[PDB]
Amino acid sequence: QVITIGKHVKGYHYIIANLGFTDGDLLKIQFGGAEVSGFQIVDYDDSLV
Amino acid sequence: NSIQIGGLFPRGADQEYSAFRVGMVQFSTSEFRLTPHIDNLEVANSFAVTNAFCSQFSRGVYAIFGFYDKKSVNTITSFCGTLHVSFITPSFPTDGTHPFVIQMRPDLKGALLSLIEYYQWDKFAYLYDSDRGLSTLQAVLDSAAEKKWQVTAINVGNINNDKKDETYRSLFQDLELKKERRVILDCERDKVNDIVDQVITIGKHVKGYHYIIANLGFTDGDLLKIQFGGAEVSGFQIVDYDDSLVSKFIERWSTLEEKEYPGAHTATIKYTSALTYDAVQVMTEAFRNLRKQRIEISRRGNAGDCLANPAVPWGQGVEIERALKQVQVEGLSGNIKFDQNGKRINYTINIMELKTNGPRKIGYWSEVDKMVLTEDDTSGLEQKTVVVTTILESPYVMMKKNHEMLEGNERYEGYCVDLAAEIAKHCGFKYKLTIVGDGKYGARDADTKIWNGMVGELVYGKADIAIAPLTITLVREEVIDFSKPFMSLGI
Amino acid sequence: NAFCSQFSRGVYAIFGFYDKKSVNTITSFCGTLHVSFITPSFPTDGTHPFVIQMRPDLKGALLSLIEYYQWDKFAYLYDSDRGLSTLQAVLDSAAEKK
Numbered sequence: 007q008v009i010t011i012g013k014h015v016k017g018y019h020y021i022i023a024n025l026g027f028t029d030g031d032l033l034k035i036q037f038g039g040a041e042v043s044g045f046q047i048v049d050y051d052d053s054l055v
Numbered sequence: 056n057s058i059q060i061g062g063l064f065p066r067g068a069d070q071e072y073s074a075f076r077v078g079m080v081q082f083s084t085s086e087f088r089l090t091p092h093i094d095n096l097e098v099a100n101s102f103a104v105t106n107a108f109c110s111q112f113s114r115g116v117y118a119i120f121g122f123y124d125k126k127s128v129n130t131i132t133s134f135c136g137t138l139h140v141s142f143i144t145p146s147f148p149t150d151g152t153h154p155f156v157i158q159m160r161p162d163l164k165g166a167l168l169s170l171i172e173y174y175q176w177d178k179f180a181y182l183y184d185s186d187r188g189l190s191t192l193q194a195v196l197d198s199a200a201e202k203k204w205q206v207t208a209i210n211v212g213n214i215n216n217d218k219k220d221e222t223y224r225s226l227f228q229d230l231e232l233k234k235e236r237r238v239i240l241d242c243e244r245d246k247v248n249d250i251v252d253q254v255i256t257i258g259k260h261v262k263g264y265h266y267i268i269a270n271l272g273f274t275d276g277d278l279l280k281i282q283f284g285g286a287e288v289s290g291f292q293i294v295d296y297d298d299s300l301v302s303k304f305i306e307r308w309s310t311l312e313e314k315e316y317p318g319a320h321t322a323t324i325k326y327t328s329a330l331t332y333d334a335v336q337v338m339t340e341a342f343r344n345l346r347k348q349r350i351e352i353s354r355r356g357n358a359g360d361c362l363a364n365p366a367v368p369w370g371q372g373v374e375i376e377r378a379l380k381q382v383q384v385e386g387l388s389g390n391i392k393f394d395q396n397g398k399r400i401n402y403t404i405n406i407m408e409l410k411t412n413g414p415r416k417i418g419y420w421s422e423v424d425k426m427v428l429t430e431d432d433t434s435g436l437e438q439k440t441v442v443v444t445t446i447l448e449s450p451y452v453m454m455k456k457n458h459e460m461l462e463g464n465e466r467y468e469g470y471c472v473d474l475a476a477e478i479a480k481h482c483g484f485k486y487k488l489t490i491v492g493d494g495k496y497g498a499r500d501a502d503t504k505i506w507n508g509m510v511g512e513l514v515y516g517k518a519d520i521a522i523a524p525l526t527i528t529l530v531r532e533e534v535i536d537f538s539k540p541f542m543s544l545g546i
Numbered sequence: 547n548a549f550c551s552q553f554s555r556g557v558y559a560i561f562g563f564y565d566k567k568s569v570n571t572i573t574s575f576c577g578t579l580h581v582s583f584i585t586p587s588f589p590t591d592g593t594h595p596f597v598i599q600m601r602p603d604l605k606g607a608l609l610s611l612i613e614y615y616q617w618d619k620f621a622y623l624y625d626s627d628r629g630l631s632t633l634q635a636v637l638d639s640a641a642e643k644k
């Protein structure tokens with residue numbers, strides 16, 4: 007609904023309060039201009055991961 | 056009289072062929088019937104167009120209806136101007152005046168020039184598609200040179216699919232270099248639905264941008280995407296849903312089964328299918344009028360090779376085309392008239408602007424008449440030019456010597472005129488400068504309390520504000536209010 | 547008529563000129579019938595098979611000459627009969643080099 011009403015340009019700023027930050031959709035507002043930060047506890051770089 | 060005709064249809068024009076099948080039995084059969092041999096073949100390969108044309112001429116039909124592409128318009132004109140076979144089409148209108156071609160689509164170009172001159176632009180970008188041709192591109196550059204416009208035209212149509220997510224990003228970021236604001240799109244509906252989605256991904260539909268769609272089915276494409284954006288989107292319609300026969304066809308069209316006619320069980324319809332429907336009306340009016348004048352179209356022999364050396368045609372087809380150019384009925388586009396060549400005149404195009412509730416019209420444009428707005432003034436909130444009363448006093452408010460030539464708020468000059476402009480600049484309202492009638496400052500009446508002058512203009516609700524040399528007293532605070540004092544004085 | 551007549555004659559190699567209006571007809575016959583066609587006319591736009599063309603391209607040289615003379619603002623008078631590929635070409639460099 008944000009991406010429909012046009013609130014993801016340069017200037018806005020979003021913080022997601024979850025643990026699976028990349029578990030949701032991020033292809034929508036990737037190219038927007040807004041900046042989006044969040045948290046992870048599952049790091050894909052590691053060996054057993 | 057089941058009269059042999061020929062039909063050309065692309066592989067994928069299912070809505071158009073279904074609308075033709077509807078219009079086939081929508082009105083016919085008090086008389087002559089039609090014998091349609093349908094060719095569901097391609098249109099890009101002119102060799103395939105040649106094979107289909109010689110096959111239907113080997114059939115020896117009297118008229119052929121169908122589409123053409125820009126790689127085939129020369130072939131169709133070159134064969135029909137030879138063999139005198141009347142050809143009728145809904146596609147893009149031809150460039151040169153060619154004989155034996157009736158073309159169902161109106162002009163767009165004078166309408167689009169009218170729209171740009173109405174919006175009063177000077178500098179814009181023009182994204183075009185090559186495969187629809189370049190006649191509008193040639194037309195806008197002449198008037199851009201004459202009307203001192205600044206056009207950045209960009210070809211976009213040859214871009215492949217597999218890079219079709221980053222090419223548009225590079226394109227609009229190059230448009231960000233000159234900081235573009237005004238875009239005219241000229242594409243097919245598929246390229247429109249592709250480019251709107253990439254705009255709405257990269258975030259270019261806020262308040263500030265402005266888009267003009269150059270098609271005929273302005274609402275035939277998707278508009279739920281950028282309806283709530285902030286950008287403003289305008290386009291053109293030739294199929295108006297308000298009308299009687301239109302809404303009759305809407306109710307007829309919606310109630311049909313999707314399985315029998317694909318793409319039919321919707322609310323709206325394509326303008327191409329609409330012109331395909333009106334084409335049957337024209338084509339049946341033709342053979343109606345030839346039985347009115349009782350002219351026999353007896354071929355009286357077979358046809359043969361299309362490569363006959365030299366081939367010799369038959370001029371009753373010239374009379375067929377002559378009676379075709381005199382057809383004047385009413386249809387989904389409205390009235391129709393033809394020229395001496397087969398091009399359509401006497402049409403009307405509605406100007407359609409997108410709003411929050413949805414699309415709406417603001418005016419029409421005719422074949423000769425320019426843009427006539429329909430005075431749809433739904434602006435419920437107009438900032439009223441507020442009432443400012445004062446009186447002539449030097450150097451507070453003074454006349455100018457050239458007041459008759461000038462107008463209104465320009466006529467007055469002084470300390471108070473300069474002050475009121477500062478107040479309106481800080482407060483953002485509109486104002487009109489007025490004069491008190493009786494020429495007094497104002498006091499109350501004995502025994503009736505009738506405040507005259509500049510007092511009663513504010514007490515009795517006549518005037519709205521008074522920037523003027525007025526003195527704060529005791530007897531004036533009870534009826535009006537004063538700000539903090541701005542200039543001191545004495546007796 | 548001429549092309550069908552000479553392929554009925556059984557030609558092994560077709561040569562001739564073309565204008566802007568017959569270019570699709572000849573490339574559409576030659577892509578089907580697989581006959582080698584040779585021309586001095588204007589070059590095409592899309593990569594079509596079986597068409598050899600002696601007239602070289604121009605647009606790179608003309609853009610290089612504009613960059614050498616170091617221009618920004620000019621007029622461009624064109625004729626349509628030879629084609630519009632150069633007109634489509636110089637507008638993109640106008641979009642880039644402002």
Ligand SMILES: NS(=O)(=O)c1cc2c(cc1Cl)N[C@H]([C@H]1C[C@H]3C=C[C@@H]1C3)NS2(=O)=O
Pocket residue numbers: 539540541542543544
């Ligand atoms: N020197 S003068 O008469 O033109 C003049 C007189 C006045 C001015 C400003 C000027 Cl320039 N503003 C004051 C206001 C400022 C503040 C203090 C009182 C009022 C609030 N009122 S005033 O005393 O009426």
